[PDB]
C-alpha cells in the first residue's frame, strides 16, 4: 500500500496593512 | 514512505485600523 | 509508493497596523 499523507503545509504569510 | 509537505497557508487577516 | 502531500498550512499571521 501507499505510504501515509505527509505533514501539513507551512503557515502562510502575513496579512495586508489595515486600513488608515 | 510518507508524502511531502502539503501547501502553505492562505495569507493572514488584515492589520487594525492605523493611528 | 509515496503517500499523498500533506494537507495545507495554516493562515498567516495578521498584517500589519494602518497608517495614521
Same mark, same amino acid.
Given at each position: /500500500? @501507499? &505510504? /501515509? !499523507? &505527509? @505533514? /501539513? #503545509? !507551512? @503557515? #502562510? =504569510? !502575513? &496579512? =495586508? =496593512? #489595515? /486600513? !488608515?
Amino acid at each position: /500500500p @501507499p &505510504g /501515509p !499523507p &505527509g @505533514p /501539513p #503545509g !507551512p @503557515p #502562510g =504569510p !502575513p &496579512g =495586508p =496593512p #489595515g /486600513p !488608515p
